[PDB]
Amino acid sequence: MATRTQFENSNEIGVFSKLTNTYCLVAVGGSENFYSAFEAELGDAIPIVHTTIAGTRIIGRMTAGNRRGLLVPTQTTDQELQHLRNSLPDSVKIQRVEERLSALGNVICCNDYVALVHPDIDRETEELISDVLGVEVFRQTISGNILVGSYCSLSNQGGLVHPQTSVQDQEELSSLLQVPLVAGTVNRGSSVVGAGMVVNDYLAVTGLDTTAPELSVIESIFRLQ
Amino acid sequence: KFRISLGLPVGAIMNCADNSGARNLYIIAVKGSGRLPAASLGDMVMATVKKGKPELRKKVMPAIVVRQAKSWRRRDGVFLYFEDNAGVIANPKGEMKGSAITGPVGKECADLWPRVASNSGVVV
Amino acid sequence: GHLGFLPRKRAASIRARVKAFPKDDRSKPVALTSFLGYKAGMTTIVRDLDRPGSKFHKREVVEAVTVVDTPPVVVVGVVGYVETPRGLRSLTTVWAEHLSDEVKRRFYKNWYKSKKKAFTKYSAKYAQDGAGIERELARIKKYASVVRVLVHTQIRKTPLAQKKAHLAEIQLNGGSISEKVDWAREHFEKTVAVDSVFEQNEMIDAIAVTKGHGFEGVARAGQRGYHSRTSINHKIYRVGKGDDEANGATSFDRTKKTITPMGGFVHYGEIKNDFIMVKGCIPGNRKRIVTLRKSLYTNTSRKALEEVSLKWIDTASKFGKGRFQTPAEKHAFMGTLKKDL
Amino acid sequence: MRIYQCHFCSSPCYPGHGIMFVRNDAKEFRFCRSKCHKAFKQRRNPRKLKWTKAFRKAAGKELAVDSTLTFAQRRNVPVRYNRELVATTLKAMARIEEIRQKRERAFYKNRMRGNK
Amino acid sequence: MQLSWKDIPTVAPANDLLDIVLNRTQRKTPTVIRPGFKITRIRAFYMRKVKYTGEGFVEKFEDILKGFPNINDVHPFHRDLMDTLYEKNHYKISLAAISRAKSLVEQVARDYVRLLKFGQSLFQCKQLKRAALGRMATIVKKLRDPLAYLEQVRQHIGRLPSIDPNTRTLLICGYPNVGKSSFLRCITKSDVDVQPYAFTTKSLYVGHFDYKYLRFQAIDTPGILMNNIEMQSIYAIAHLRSCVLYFMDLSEQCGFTIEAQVKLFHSIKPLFANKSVMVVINERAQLLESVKEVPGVEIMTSSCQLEENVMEVRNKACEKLLASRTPFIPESVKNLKKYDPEDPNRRKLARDIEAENGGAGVFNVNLKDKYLLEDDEWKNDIMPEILDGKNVYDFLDPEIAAKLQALEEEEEKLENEGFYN
RNA sequence: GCUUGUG
RNA sequence: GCGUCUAAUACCUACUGAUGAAUGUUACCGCAAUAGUAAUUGAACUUAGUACGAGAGGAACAGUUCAUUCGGAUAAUUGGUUUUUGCGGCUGUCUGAUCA
RNA sequence: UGUACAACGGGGUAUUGUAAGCAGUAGAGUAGCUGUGUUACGAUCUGCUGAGAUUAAGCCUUUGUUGUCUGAUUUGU
């Protein structure tokens, strides 16, 4: 399932697209080949929608969510929200979140059952995430970095944590999420795995620069095969 | 790269918007662009840290401007500006050296620099 | 400065005649090669930008456009041209015998003092048994290779303190010149609507005299402005109509507000007749006559083939820092005032 | 496209009009014609300026609170497109405009009673 | 780059360099002068011309020296490879000659600049300029042979394989073209002939392959019998941090007996026996088994007629070198067949649809009909989003039917009483 | 009816 | 032809401008011998991680999308700009006091 | 000598910002008559009052008031 792709000769796959177990989102860039790359590995099994946040191509890092629902920042226009709702099945919830910051994707790292957010995030934001997404919220940081969303990546089969994450932190995260976790790099030594790649319970997408050892590590940690 | 209102003068000092340990950047180069040269939001510029740890002093390194503070016409019509000039330091390949970026980050700059957007916590 | 546009002397007249006409073919139906209009201020436009490969594909783009009044134009005569080694030569001209008072005034510098004998004798001559006109038409058809139709703008329908109409020659872009003169026969004294020549998304070029300034100081003093200039690749966004409402409305805004800004245009009146909206600006100030033409060439580029998607048109008061779009909205937001009661 | 009430004057902010300010606190401040933006730059309190909507609402010159104000809330959760819903919303807005005008006229009449 | 030297600029032949320099100085420098010109003006003109010619010659010599690497300081393995391909002393002699010529040109130019300042007549200055130019030309021409030698060595160095002795690698060696050529032709993309004659290969052919996602490189020894080729093969076997895979033949291939191969192996054994040797063989076999007595060599019988087995040998060599709550997967995913890039029945991806319509260029894709709805007939909608200056999104919500009725009831509850008076 | 590249 | 850290940094005549007698008068329209002439460089998705290449690295055209420079234009939005000396406030301040 | 035009006025749109004056329970502070204890002076504040003013000398409209419409010279195949 592991596939190598690049959006307009760009290695940051996790920035131009957002993918989950129930839906996939990609930018509206002129190069449609990026959409075909996801279609080949997914087809019509799950909806693939062209969308943007405030017209930006960084929708991947501008939004966070899980299978239950998707969240968008305040910068998202009402037109974009209605387009997403029309193009997204009603089974998946949509809820706008208001905060001083805008980078929800970098601020919230979450999977289908647990969520990790900025310790100083909005008080009501944690409740909104717990309700809409139906996942636990933990005010914690990994690898001593505030931007857990981009640095780390989480799923149900596994999670590729920051390569610099300590052994004790990895063990604690695995015991909390009840899933295996291993520290490693992607995109030819890129420490920000979340921005460089996206992963779900049945598919993994990485940049073309991703070396074979990185692909093998991603396959092993997520137990694709 | 759509045109934006310039105005940053050569030699301008801007606040460092990353936790890499630096606090200001001395812009001395407008590399990446073709008369009085000037920088703009999202432009990669080589600069030297004036105030900060001695390690980063006296050595030129690439930097990306995240705030301009000068009124510019966004392609969506709405006029907007920042409170003060700010920038971030990164390698020529766009890999952010600073672990995290602080303060507002230009939407136009973040869009053209996916790596900066990933390390940018406050878009717009 | 650009040596190409030198010398920088003033334009010969307020109206800039068309230097060249678009290529001609003998297969397509007869149509007017150019149209006359008047510059009417400027306004902002916002719409979605459907453009493949663009960074702002399927995004919203805000840009400025100019508004040019284009009241229905009426034909008054036709001029035939024969080919000669010294260029085209005008062999004869014809008139419809029902020239309006405005065109008659164009032939006089002091209308009130004049006895108003503009076409009395010509009118009497036309009233014969067709011999004096049929012969001229046959002679024009037999020899003329290209036929130009004389038309003028209905100045009386424009909010301008000028009864003097503008008379300019308009060429025909095709029609097997026999059918050109046949069409001219069917259009004498008739009016041609803007929508019957131009259309939305069509690429046109404009020729007019830009704003003048007077004496100005190549490191030498001279005249600045007030020169004929041709601007090409001007896209027509909206084609206005003077016989229906919703002139400024769109499928998105769908409001019943007219394109005329609140309080009227600055230094200009109100647009009620047919008008044309084109992106960018035309080299001409307000209350200035301008002419439109189809770029003289076939524009197959995307900028031409792309279809506009007008979303909303700004109609706030250009007079000062206007904010309210319609009087009803201003009243609702501001509420009743001492002026009302 | 979006329209927002000016942070200072509360007047509508049509596209391509006014200016926006992004302070270090990272929130969007929409402004109307320059006058009020410059007034904001002076830290003037809109609740005390006689000529601004904020003071009038606070001072009770115009109806401070009304049922019609709750119908103009910007919905957060998106709603699936429905042409019938669109038409009904258009009709409701058309009726609400007249209702708001009548209520504002009544409030103005009840405020000018002191002239007797 | 220490592993490659293709960046070296092409050397200019004897006549080519002088002519190029003379043309360059003639074109750039001024050309028109008169006897009536001031003495200082003529001085400056001739001095500038001579100095520009000298700087051009110096730049050419410096570029030539910089491009060509110093054999001694490159690498012991590369140094020995060059010493096998050429003569180290001769190469150093050529480099020293180039450096001496450059220094002499610099000295002559400086002296003539210091000397031309005392000329009187225009012809005297012209003669001094000719003196400097002729001295430079003679110095350049004196290097006619070393220039050609540098050109020839440059033409060959740029095509040499760029191997890395430090990384793990395997070496294949044996008698000339015993079959190892086929082994290389099947273990890597490198294409080498296997013609029966002895020296089918005359260079260290190199190929790369990946084992366990670990990069590996293999080098094909041309052959071993002294000769330059044999010395190069010996140096490659010794200096390189790589195992050596000896090749033998149980059959009559190459027309050489097993005894000769055994004798050659014993003769060369001392300097590679400790490098984890392996022997590949393509009633005398009893004597051949004597090699097994060596602690560091192992033998496995095989043949080139079954070259499909090269994978096992490669794996053995690589191993020897190295040793030295349930998830939420929709049922649709687990039912749809995996996409086949070449199946005629494969679903048409959006890429094909875009290409047919015109691609990402002249044609723009449309999102209509892509978004789900209760009914697909009314998919064509404009979504006005604005009405009478009020955003529709501020009023677009369900249940508005009851809200409007309640508002109308409230309005009726006040119109009857005339509260609006 | 001067001038330009090879002591 | 165009530029020269970037792709690269080898006392009277002429002049631009503006009047003006003329031929039957005035006015409208049109042709053009003639003098000048302009656009400019780069990147960006394609085609590509394809051809090429053991590898390292990595083509090009058709098409499309952007920016620098130079020229002709516009105030539709923003800034500048105010003898509109327009408004409101304030400093010294007079018409006896308060407005003005 | 009629959709003719000029000067005012009205209306539309805009700039500034709540006016001269009136009345008050809101009232610094002083006096009287010892507890809004009471009443005069009276800084300010409240309602009239998004009120007042400006509005083309290069804004728009005009139905309202009102005035004007004839002074010399030149030009011919």
JSON list of N, CA and C (backbone and C1' of nucleotides) in Angstrom, two decimals, chain C residues 4 8-10 15 42 44 54 81 148 169 210-211 229 302 318, chain G residues 16-18 27 29-31 36 38 64-66 71-74 76:
[
{"chain": "C", "resi": 4, "resn": "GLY", "atom": "N", "xyz": [8.78, 55.32, -30.18]},
{"chain": "C", "resi": 4, "resn": "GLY", "atom": "CA", "xyz": [7.77, 54.87, -31.12]},
{"chain": "C", "resi": 4, "resn": "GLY", "atom": "C", "xyz": [6.57, 55.79, -31.18]},
{"chain": "C", "resi": 8, "resn": "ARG", "atom": "N", "xyz": [5.15, 63.88, -29.66]},
{"chain": "C", "resi": 8, "resn": "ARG", "atom": "CA", "xyz": [4.15, 63.94, -28.59]},
{"chain": "C", "resi": 8, "resn": "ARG", "atom": "C", "xyz": [3.16, 65.09, -28.78]},
{"chain": "C", "resi": 9, "resn": "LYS", "atom": "N", "xyz": [2.85, 65.45, -30.02]},
{"chain": "C", "resi": 9, "resn": "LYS", "atom": "CA", "xyz": [1.91, 66.53, -30.27]},
{"chain": "C", "resi": 9, "resn": "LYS", "atom": "C", "xyz": [0.49, 66.11, -29.89]},
{"chain": "C", "resi": 10, "resn": "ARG", "atom": "N", "xyz": [-0.37, 67.11, -29.71]},
{"chain": "C", "resi": 10, "resn": "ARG", "atom": "CA", "xyz": [-1.75, 66.85, -29.33]},
{"chain": "C", "resi": 10, "resn": "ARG", "atom": "C", "xyz": [-2.49, 66.10, -30.44]},
{"chain": "C", "resi": 15, "resn": "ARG", "atom": "N", "xyz": [-12.15, 63.01, -31.03]},
{"chain": "C", "resi": 15, "resn": "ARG", "atom": "CA", "xyz": [-12.46, 61.66, -31.47]},
{"chain": "C", "resi": 15, "resn": "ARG", "atom": "C", "xyz": [-11.28, 61.10, -32.26]},
{"chain": "C", "resi": 42, "resn": "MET", "atom": "N", "xyz": [-15.30, 54.37, -13.14]},
{"chain": "C", "resi": 42, "resn": "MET", "atom": "CA", "xyz": [-14.67, 53.07, -12.95]},
{"chain": "C", "resi": 42, "resn": "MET", "atom": "C", "xyz": [-15.28, 52.42, -11.71]},
{"chain": "C", "resi": 44, "resn": "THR", "atom": "N", "xyz": [-15.11, 48.50, -9.13]},
{"chain": "C", "resi": 44, "resn": "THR", "atom": "CA", "xyz": [-14.45, 47.25, -8.76]},
{"chain": "C", "resi": 44, "resn": "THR", "atom": "C", "xyz": [-15.35, 46.06, -9.10]},
{"chain": "C", "resi": 54, "resn": "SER", "atom": "N", "xyz": [-3.41, 27.96, -13.03]},
{"chain": "C", "resi": 54, "resn": "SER", "atom": "CA", "xyz": [-3.12, 29.17, -12.27]},
{"chain": "C", "resi": 54, "resn": "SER", "atom": "C", "xyz": [-3.04, 28.85, -10.78]},
{"chain": "C", "resi": 81, "resn": "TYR", "atom": "N", "xyz": [-15.50, 52.32, -51.02]},
{"chain": "C", "resi": 81, "resn": "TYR", "atom": "CA", "xyz": [-14.09, 52.55, -51.30]},
{"chain": "C", "resi": 81, "resn": "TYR", "atom": "C", "xyz": [-13.63, 51.61, -52.41]},
{"chain": "C", "resi": 148, "resn": "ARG", "atom": "N", "xyz": [-17.97, 50.81, -46.02]},
{"chain": "C", "resi": 148, "resn": "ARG", "atom": "CA", "xyz": [-17.98, 51.33, -44.66]},
{"chain": "C", "resi": 148, "resn": "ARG", "atom": "C", "xyz": [-19.31, 52.04, -44.42]},
{"chain": "C", "resi": 169, "resn": "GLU", "atom": "N", "xyz": [-16.97, 56.74, -39.38]},
{"chain": "C", "resi": 169, "resn": "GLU", "atom": "CA", "xyz": [-17.18, 55.65, -40.32]},
{"chain": "C", "resi": 169, "resn": "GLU", "atom": "C", "xyz": [-16.90, 54.30, -39.65]},
{"chain": "C", "resi": 210, "resn": "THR", "atom": "N", "xyz": [-6.29, 59.99, -24.27]},
{"chain": "C", "resi": 210, "resn": "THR", "atom": "CA", "xyz": [-6.09, 59.90, -22.83]},
{"chain": "C", "resi": 210, "resn": "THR", "atom": "C", "xyz": [-6.23, 61.28, -22.18]},
{"chain": "C", "resi": 211, "resn": "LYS", "atom": "N", "xyz": [-6.21, 61.27, -20.84]},
{"chain": "C", "resi": 211, "resn": "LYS", "atom": "CA", "xyz": [-6.34, 62.51, -20.09]},
{"chain": "C", "resi": 211, "resn": "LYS", "atom": "C", "xyz": [-5.23, 63.48, -20.46]},
{"chain": "C", "resi": 229, "resn": "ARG", "atom": "N", "xyz": [-4.37, 56.67, -28.14]},
{"chain": "C", "resi": 229, "resn": "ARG", "atom": "CA", "xyz": [-3.69, 55.47, -27.68]},
{"chain": "C", "resi": 229, "resn": "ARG", "atom": "C", "xyz": [-4.61, 54.27, -27.87]},
{"chain": "C", "resi": 302, "resn": "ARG", "atom": "N", "xyz": [-5.82, 31.64, -23.84]},
{"chain": "C", "resi": 302, "resn": "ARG", "atom": "CA", "xyz": [-6.74, 31.33, -22.75]},
{"chain": "C", "resi": 302, "resn": "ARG", "atom": "C", "xyz": [-7.39, 32.60, -22.21]},
{"chain": "C", "resi": 318, "resn": "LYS", "atom": "N", "xyz": [-18.97, 56.19, -5.22]},
{"chain": "C", "resi": 318, "resn": "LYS", "atom": "CA", "xyz": [-17.61, 56.63, -5.54]},
{"chain": "C", "resi": 318, "resn": "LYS", "atom": "C", "xyz": [-17.36, 58.05, -5.07]},
{"chain": "G", "resi": 16, "resn": "U", "atom": "P", "xyz": [11.67, 67.51, -32.64]},
{"chain": "G", "resi": 16, "resn": "U", "atom": "O5'", "xyz": [10.44, 67.41, -31.64]},
{"chain": "G", "resi": 16, "resn": "U", "atom": "C5'", "xyz": [10.24, 66.26, -30.83]},
{"chain": "G", "resi": 16, "resn": "U", "atom": "C4'", "xyz": [9.69, 66.64, -29.48]},
{"chain": "G", "resi": 16, "resn": "U", "atom": "C3'", "xyz": [8.41, 67.46, -29.48]},
{"chain": "G", "resi": 16, "resn": "U", "atom": "O3'", "xyz": [7.24, 66.69, -29.66]},
{"chain": "G", "resi": 16, "resn": "U", "atom": "C1'", "xyz": [9.98, 68.47, -28.04]},
{"chain": "G", "resi": 17, "resn": "G", "atom": "P", "xyz": [6.06, 67.27, -30.59]},
{"chain": "G", "resi": 17, "resn": "G", "atom": "O5'", "xyz": [5.60, 68.59, -29.84]},
{"chain": "G", "resi": 17, "resn": "G", "atom": "C5'", "xyz": [5.10, 68.53, -28.51]},
{"chain": "G", "resi": 17, "resn": "G", "atom": "C4'", "xyz": [4.63, 69.87, -28.01]},
{"chain": "G", "resi": 17, "resn": "G", "atom": "C3'", "xyz": [3.62, 70.60, -28.87]},
{"chain": "G", "resi": 17, "resn": "G", "atom": "O3'", "xyz": [2.31, 70.08, -28.78]},
{"chain": "G", "resi": 17, "resn": "G", "atom": "C1'", "xyz": [5.27, 72.12, -28.14]},
{"chain": "G", "resi": 18, "resn": "A", "atom": "P", "xyz": [1.30, 70.26, -30.02]},
{"chain": "G", "resi": 18, "resn": "A", "atom": "O5'", "xyz": [1.04, 71.83, -30.07]},
{"chain": "G", "resi": 18, "resn": "A", "atom": "C5'", "xyz": [0.48, 72.51, -28.96]},
{"chain": "G", "resi": 18, "resn": "A", "atom": "C4'", "xyz": [0.41, 74.00, -29.18]},
{"chain": "G", "resi": 18, "resn": "A", "atom": "C3'", "xyz": [-0.27, 74.47, -30.45]},
{"chain": "G", "resi": 18, "resn": "A", "atom": "O3'", "xyz": [-1.69, 74.42, -30.38]},
{"chain": "G", "resi": 18, "resn": "A", "atom": "C1'", "xyz": [1.71, 75.71, -30.11]},
{"chain": "G", "resi": 27, "resn": "A", "atom": "P", "xyz": [-14.23, 75.84, -41.10]},
{"chain": "G", "resi": 27, "resn": "A", "atom": "O5'", "xyz": [-15.14, 74.54, -40.97]},
{"chain": "G", "resi": 27, "resn": "A", "atom": "C5'", "xyz": [-16.24, 74.50, -40.07]},
{"chain": "G", "resi": 27, "resn": "A", "atom": "C4'", "xyz": [-17.19, 73.38, -40.39]},
{"chain": "G", "resi": 27, "resn": "A", "atom": "C3'", "xyz": [-16.59, 71.99, -40.47]},
{"chain": "G", "resi": 27, "resn": "A", "atom": "O3'", "xyz": [-16.36, 71.41, -39.19]},
{"chain": "G", "resi": 27, "resn": "A", "atom": "C1'", "xyz": [-18.05, 72.32, -42.29]},
{"chain": "G", "resi": 29, "resn": "C", "atom": "P", "xyz": [-15.08, 64.64, -38.68]},
{"chain": "G", "resi": 29, "resn": "C", "atom": "O5'", "xyz": [-15.05, 63.48, -39.77]},
{"chain": "G", "resi": 29, "resn": "C", "atom": "C5'", "xyz": [-16.08, 62.50, -39.79]},
{"chain": "G", "resi": 29, "resn": "C", "atom": "C4'", "xyz": [-16.05, 61.69, -41.07]},
{"chain": "G", "resi": 29, "resn": "C", "atom": "C3'", "xyz": [-14.73, 61.04, -41.42]},
{"chain": "G", "resi": 29, "resn": "C", "atom": "O3'", "xyz": [-14.46, 59.87, -40.67]},
{"chain": "G", "resi": 29, "resn": "C", "atom": "C1'", "xyz": [-15.64, 62.05, -43.35]},
{"chain": "G", "resi": 30, "resn": "G", "atom": "P", "xyz": [-12.95, 59.51, -40.25]},
{"chain": "G", "resi": 30, "resn": "G", "atom": "O5'", "xyz": [-12.30, 58.96, -41.59]},
{"chain": "G", "resi": 30, "resn": "G", "atom": "C5'", "xyz": [-12.86, 57.83, -42.24]},
{"chain": "G", "resi": 30, "resn": "G", "atom": "C4'", "xyz": [-12.38, 57.71, -43.67]},
{"chain": "G", "resi": 30, "resn": "G", "atom": "C3'", "xyz": [-10.89, 57.57, -43.87]},
{"chain": "G", "resi": 30, "resn": "G", "atom": "O3'", "xyz": [-10.42, 56.26, -43.63]},
{"chain": "G", "resi": 30, "resn": "G", "atom": "C1'", "xyz": [-11.76, 59.13, -45.43]},
{"chain": "G", "resi": 31, "resn": "C", "atom": "P", "xyz": [-8.87, 56.01, -43.25]},
{"chain": "G", "resi": 31, "resn": "C", "atom": "O5'", "xyz": [-8.12, 56.12, -44.65]},
{"chain": "G", "resi": 31, "resn": "C", "atom": "C5'", "xyz": [-8.37, 55.19, -45.69]},
{"chain": "G", "resi": 31, "resn": "C", "atom": "C4'", "xyz": [-7.49, 55.44, -46.89]},
{"chain": "G", "resi": 31, "resn": "C", "atom": "C3'", "xyz": [-6.00, 55.52, -46.60]},
{"chain": "G", "resi": 31, "resn": "C", "atom": "O3'", "xyz": [-5.39, 54.24, -46.50]},
{"chain": "G", "resi": 31, "resn": "C", "atom": "C1'", "xyz": [-6.63, 57.32, -47.99]},
{"chain": "G", "resi": 36, "resn": "G", "atom": "P", "xyz": [13.36, 56.97, -39.88]},
{"chain": "G", "resi": 36, "resn": "G", "atom": "O5'", "xyz": [12.66, 56.77, -38.46]},
{"chain": "G", "resi": 36, "resn": "G", "atom": "C5'", "xyz": [13.12, 57.48, -37.32]},
{"chain": "G", "resi": 36, "resn": "G", "atom": "C4'", "xyz": [12.31, 57.16, -36.10]},
{"chain": "G", "resi": 36, "resn": "G", "atom": "C3'", "xyz": [12.13, 55.68, -35.78]},
{"chain": "G", "resi": 36, "resn": "G", "atom": "O3'", "xyz": [13.26, 55.13, -35.14]},
{"chain": "G", "resi": 36, "resn": "G", "atom": "C1'", "xyz": [10.05, 56.80, -35.56]},
{"chain": "G", "resi": 38, "resn": "A", "atom": "P", "xyz": [11.91, 48.37, -32.62]},
{"chain": "G", "resi": 38, "resn": "A", "atom": "O5'", "xyz": [10.91, 47.74, -31.55]},
{"chain": "G", "resi": 38, "resn": "A", "atom": "C5'", "xyz": [10.89, 46.35, -31.29]},
{"chain": "G", "resi": 38, "resn": "A", "atom": "C4'", "xyz": [9.97, 46.00, -30.15]},
{"chain": "G", "resi": 38, "resn": "A", "atom": "C3'", "xyz": [8.53, 46.48, -30.32]},
{"chain": "G", "resi": 38, "resn": "A", "atom": "O3'", "xyz": [7.63, 45.54, -29.74]},
{"chain": "G", "resi": 38, "resn": "A", "atom": "C1'", "xyz": [9.46, 47.45, -28.37]},
{"chain": "G", "resi": 64, "resn": "U", "atom": "P", "xyz": [-1.09, 27.96, -24.68]},
{"chain": "G", "resi": 64, "resn": "U", "atom": "O5'", "xyz": [-1.21, 27.76, -23.11]},
{"chain": "G", "resi": 64, "resn": "U", "atom": "C5'", "xyz": [-2.40, 27.26, -22.52]},
{"chain": "G", "resi": 64, "resn": "U", "atom": "C4'", "xyz": [-2.17, 26.79, -21.11]},
{"chain": "G", "resi": 64, "resn": "U", "atom": "C3'", "xyz": [-1.78, 27.86, -20.10]},
{"chain": "G", "resi": 64, "resn": "U", "atom": "O3'", "xyz": [-2.89, 28.60, -19.61]},
{"chain": "G", "resi": 64, "resn": "U", "atom": "C1'", "xyz": [-0.33, 26.02, -19.88]},
{"chain": "G", "resi": 65, "resn": "U", "atom": "P", "xyz": [-2.75, 30.17, -19.32]},
{"chain": "G", "resi": 65, "resn": "U", "atom": "O5'", "xyz": [-1.97, 30.24, -17.94]},
{"chain": "G", "resi": 65, "resn": "U", "atom": "C5'", "xyz": [-2.51, 29.63, -16.77]},
{"chain": "G", "resi": 65, "resn": "U", "atom": "C4'", "xyz": [-1.56, 29.72, -15.61]},
{"chain": "G", "resi": 65, "resn": "U", "atom": "C3'", "xyz": [-1.07, 31.11, -15.24]},
{"chain": "G", "resi": 65, "resn": "U", "atom": "O3'", "xyz": [-2.02, 31.84, -14.47]},
{"chain": "G", "resi": 65, "resn": "U", "atom": "C1'", "xyz": [0.76, 29.62, -15.28]},
{"chain": "G", "resi": 66, "resn": "C", "atom": "P", "xyz": [-1.79, 33.41, -14.19]},
{"chain": "G", "resi": 66, "resn": "C", "atom": "O5'", "xyz": [-0.50, 33.45, -13.27]},
{"chain": "G", "resi": 66, "resn": "C", "atom": "C5'", "xyz": [0.22, 34.66, -13.07]},
{"chain": "G", "resi": 66, "resn": "C", "atom": "C4'", "xyz": [1.50, 34.42, -12.32]},
{"chain": "G", "resi": 66, "resn": "C", "atom": "C3'", "xyz": [2.50, 35.57, -12.33]},
{"chain": "G", "resi": 66, "resn": "C", "atom": "O3'", "xyz": [2.19, 36.58, -11.37]},
{"chain": "G", "resi": 66, "resn": "C", "atom": "C1'", "xyz": [3.62, 33.57, -12.86]},
{"chain": "G", "resi": 71, "resn": "G", "atom": "P", "xyz": [10.44, 53.65, -18.88]},
{"chain": "G", "resi": 71, "resn": "G", "atom": "O5'", "xyz": [9.33, 53.50, -20.01]},
{"chain": "G", "resi": 71, "resn": "G", "atom": "C5'", "xyz": [9.62, 53.79, -21.37]},
{"chain": "G", "resi": 71, "resn": "G", "atom": "C4'", "xyz": [8.48, 53.40, -22.28]},
{"chain": "G", "resi": 71, "resn": "G", "atom": "C3'", "xyz": [7.12, 53.98, -21.94]},
{"chain": "G", "resi": 71, "resn": "G", "atom": "O3'", "xyz": [6.95, 55.30, -22.40]},
{"chain": "G", "resi": 71, "resn": "G", "atom": "C1'", "xyz": [6.91, 51.66, -22.38]},
{"chain": "G", "resi": 72, "resn": "G", "atom": "P", "xyz": [5.86, 56.27, -21.72]},
{"chain": "G", "resi": 72, "resn": "G", "atom": "O5'", "xyz": [4.47, 55.65, -22.17]},
{"chain": "G", "resi": 72, "resn": "G", "atom": "C5'", "xyz": [4.06, 55.70, -23.53]},
{"chain": "G", "resi": 72, "resn": "G", "atom": "C4'", "xyz": [2.65, 55.19, -23.70]},
{"chain": "G", "resi": 72, "resn": "G", "atom": "C3'", "xyz": [1.62, 55.78, -22.75]},
{"chain": "G", "resi": 72, "resn": "G", "atom": "O3'", "xyz": [1.14, 57.04, -23.17]},
{"chain": "G", "resi": 72, "resn": "G", "atom": "C1'", "xyz": [1.38, 53.42, -22.82]},
{"chain": "G", "resi": 73, "resn": "A", "atom": "P", "xyz": [0.33, 57.98, -22.14]},
{"chain": "G", "resi": 73, "resn": "A", "atom": "O5'", "xyz": [-1.03, 57.19, -21.91]},
{"chain": "G", "resi": 73, "resn": "A", "atom": "C5'", "xyz": [-1.86, 57.48, -20.80]},
{"chain": "G", "resi": 73, "resn": "A", "atom": "C4'", "xyz": [-2.82, 56.36, -20.52]},
{"chain": "G", "resi": 73, "resn": "A", "atom": "C3'", "xyz": [-3.55, 56.43, -19.19]},
{"chain": "G", "resi": 73, "resn": "A", "atom": "O3'", "xyz": [-4.69, 57.27, -19.24]},
{"chain": "G", "resi": 73, "resn": "A", "atom": "C1'", "xyz": [-2.67, 54.25, -19.49]},
{"chain": "G", "resi": 74, "resn": "U", "atom": "P", "xyz": [-4.97, 58.34, -18.07]},
{"chain": "G", "resi": 74, "resn": "U", "atom": "O5'", "xyz": [-5.71, 57.49, -16.95]},
{"chain": "G", "resi": 74, "resn": "U", "atom": "C5'", "xyz": [-7.01, 56.96, -17.18]},
{"chain": "G", "resi": 74, "resn": "U", "atom": "C4'", "xyz": [-7.45, 56.07, -16.04]},
{"chain": "G", "resi": 74, "resn": "U", "atom": "C3'", "xyz": [-7.33, 56.68, -14.65]},
{"chain": "G", "resi": 74, "resn": "U", "atom": "O3'", "xyz": [-8.41, 57.53, -14.32]},
{"chain": "G", "resi": 74, "resn": "U", "atom": "C1'", "xyz": [-6.42, 54.49, -14.65]},
{"chain": "G", "resi": 76, "resn": "A", "atom": "P", "xyz": [-12.21, 56.50, -8.38]},
{"chain": "G", "resi": 76, "resn": "A", "atom": "O5'", "xyz": [-12.26, 54.96, -8.76]},
{"chain": "G", "resi": 76, "resn": "A", "atom": "C5'", "xyz": [-13.49, 54.33, -9.10]},
{"chain": "G", "resi": 76, "resn": "A", "atom": "C4'", "xyz": [-13.49, 52.86, -8.73]},
{"chain": "G", "resi": 76, "resn": "A", "atom": "C3'", "xyz": [-12.77, 52.49, -7.45]},
{"chain": "G", "resi": 76, "resn": "A", "atom": "O3'", "xyz": [-13.54, 52.74, -6.28]},
{"chain": "G", "resi": 76, "resn": "A", "atom": "C1'", "xyz": [-12.15, 50.98, -9.16]}
]
